[PDB]
Structure formats: structure tokens, C-alpha cells
């Protein structure tokens, strides 16, 4: 069903974070070398690059409505840059340990960061980037945070403590805790974006991807299709598929109805670490970051 085309591939140091701009044909990549890059994948031209730090930058997102990128790095800092001028906007110590993941609220001026310090923190850019809340309860590194796109007053965190917690902004205790049975912990969590299913998905070092119903708080399915740690698994915004990537070097595209792998892709950049999908499904674009660079693919 899929006519997959290679749009652009770029060789670089290990890519740890990746994101699509919603209106410009750009991807942001954040590298293990401390560099962050903005690429136009249609013209294949580097728009901007910034040496942010000497430590890995694991997390990076566009905040398009503010013309910003926001990045989190192993030196404990969150930094924000204006992508039009290159100007640094803010630079602060966010956690006393590595930052694994950043999520940006779709309508409110809030950012979440998930950290090895066992917490998620909420920052408010309309209050001078003040720490508004710290979410405590996890017992190992918080690897991934994601707002519920259908209800962004709530969000999920995936953790190496083998749980996903779902939280409410303004509330100190989680709504609930899912014990994943993923005994090597959770590396990633993502929400299904459409109203027809109240589903989330987790990826683990235990080789599995699991689909969860957040209303019944039950596991719908366990999908095992990789030979090494699964770095991520996400629902596509417009196609009935799931995309996963692994330290086995593959991307897999799963049918989201049958839970079968429909395509296995080896882009030849060694281990896969991160994923993004174009937020409005433009050309059904997806992009993944690897040890040896990144690739942008269109799906037809």
C-alpha cells in the first residue's frame, strides 16, 4: 500500500533528536556531538547550524508559533534559539542530570522536560521560563514525555522503572500508573492522535512495542519485531500505521489494524535513535535519526 521514497539523507555524527517544522520544509536534528542543525529537505540545503554545547543534545523541538527551537542537553541545560536570527533566547539549568525528552504544549506557553533526575518539569515561557510544576513519582530515568493531543491538560511519561504515568497539569499525583510488563523499562511513549481509539504506545529494550488503552488501563497488544533495543514507536498522523526504530538498525512500518510489519527499511546508517512525523501529514513525511546521520522519507 506504501510507495516509500527517499526524500533526503544526510551523513553526520549521531542524531539523538529530530523534529519537523509544520509550515517550512525543514527538519531540526540534535546531535551527540553537541551540534544542532536545521535542514531544508526539499532543496537539500543546511539552513542553519549551531554548536550548542560539547555534550550530547538528546532533545529538540520546534516552537513554530514563536519562531524558536528548544533543545535539552547532557550538561543539564535547556536552551532556546530563534531560528530566523540564530539568537539565543534563554539558557537555564533545568535538571541536575541528563534531559531525555522535551514536549511543547500545542496552545499554552508550556514545555515539559523529562530527566534522569526521576522527574518531569513544566516550564512557562510567559512567566520568564519559570518552573511551574515538578512531577514526582517515577523511580528511574524518565525517557520520554508526550502531551495527549486530544487532551493536552494531560500528558504521559515513559520511564526505565517499567511504568508509564499519566499526569494532569496542576495535579501532584498521577492520574494512573501503567506497569508495562516491559521489564527492561520504557524508552518511548506516544499517543494515537485520532478520537476513535484511546490508545498509547510504548517501546522497550525488551524488544517489544505495546499498545495500551488509557481508559481501561489495559494492554491491547504486544508487538515484537526487532532484534535489539526499540528506540521509539509512534502512530502516524494520517496513515493507519505505526513506525518503530531500533538499535538493530531497522525502521519497521506496522499495520495499525493487524499489528503486522508491512515494511522493513534499512537506510544503512547503523543504529536508529529518534523519529518524527510531519504534523499535518504533508507528503506523509517521516524522518529518523541514526548513528551515522538522518533520513527523510515520503510515504504514498
Amino acid at each position: 500500500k506504501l510507495d516509500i521514497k527517499k526524500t533526503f539523507s544526510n551523513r553526520s555524527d549521531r542524531v539523538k533528536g529530530i523534529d519537523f517544522h509544520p509550515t517550512e520544509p525543514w527538519v531540526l536534528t540534535t546531535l551527540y556531538s553537541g551540534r544542532v542543525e536545521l535542514w531544508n529537505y526539499e532543496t537539500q540545503v543546511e539552513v542553519r547550524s549551531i554548536q550548542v554545547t560539547e555534550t550530547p543534545v538528546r532533545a529538540g523541538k520546534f516552537i513554530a508559533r514563536k519562531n524558536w527551537i528548544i533543545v535539552g542537553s547532557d550538561d543539564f541545560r535547556i536552551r532556546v534559539f530563534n531560528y530566523n536570527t540564530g539568537e539565543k533566547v534563554v539558557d537555564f539549568e533545568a535538571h541536575p542530570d541528563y534531559i531525555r525528552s522535551i514536549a511543547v504544549h500545542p496552545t499554552k506557553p508550556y514545555v515539559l522536560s523529562g530527566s534522569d533526575d526521576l522527574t518531569v518539569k513544566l516550564w512557562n515561557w510567559e512567566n520568564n521560563w519559570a518552573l511551574e510544576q515538578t512531577f514526582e513519582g517515577h523511580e528511574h530515568f524518565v525517557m520520554c514525555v508526550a502531551f495527549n493531543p486530544k487532551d493536552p491538560s494531560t500528558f504521559a511519561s515513559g520511564c526505565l522503572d517499567r511504568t508509564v504515568k499519566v499526569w494532569s497539569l496542576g495535579q501532584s499525583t498521577p492520574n494512573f500508573t501503567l506497569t508495562t510488563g516491559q521489564e527492561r523499562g520504557v524508552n518511548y511513549v506516544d499517543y494515537y492522535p485520532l478520537p476513535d481509539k484511546p490508545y498509547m504506545i510504548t517501546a522497550s529494550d525488551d524488544l517489544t512495542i505495546k499498545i495500551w488503552d488509557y481508559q481501561t488501563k489495559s494492554c491491547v497488544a504486544t508487538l515484537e519485531g526487532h532484534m535489539s533495543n526499540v528506540s521509539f514507536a509512534v502512530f502516524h498522523p494520517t496513515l493507519p500505521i505505526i513506525i518503530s526504530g531500533s538499535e538493530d538498525g531497522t525502521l519497521k512500518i506496522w499495520n495499525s489494524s493487524t499489528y503486522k510489519v508491512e515494511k522493513t527499511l534499512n537506510v544503512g546508517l547503523e543504529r536508529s535513535w529518534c523519529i518524527a512525523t510531519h504534523p499535518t501529514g504533508r507528503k506523509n513525511y517521516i524522518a529518523s535519526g541514526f548513528d551515522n546521520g538522518f533520513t527523510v522519507l515520503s510515504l504514498g
Partner: peptide
């Protein structure tokens, strides 16, 4: 190995 901390 007993431990493989997530540093990569």
C-alpha cells in the same frame, strides 16, 4: 555485563 547505563 551486569549494568549497561544509557549513555549512548
Amino acid at each position: 555485563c551486569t549494568f549497561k547505563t544509557k549513555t549512548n
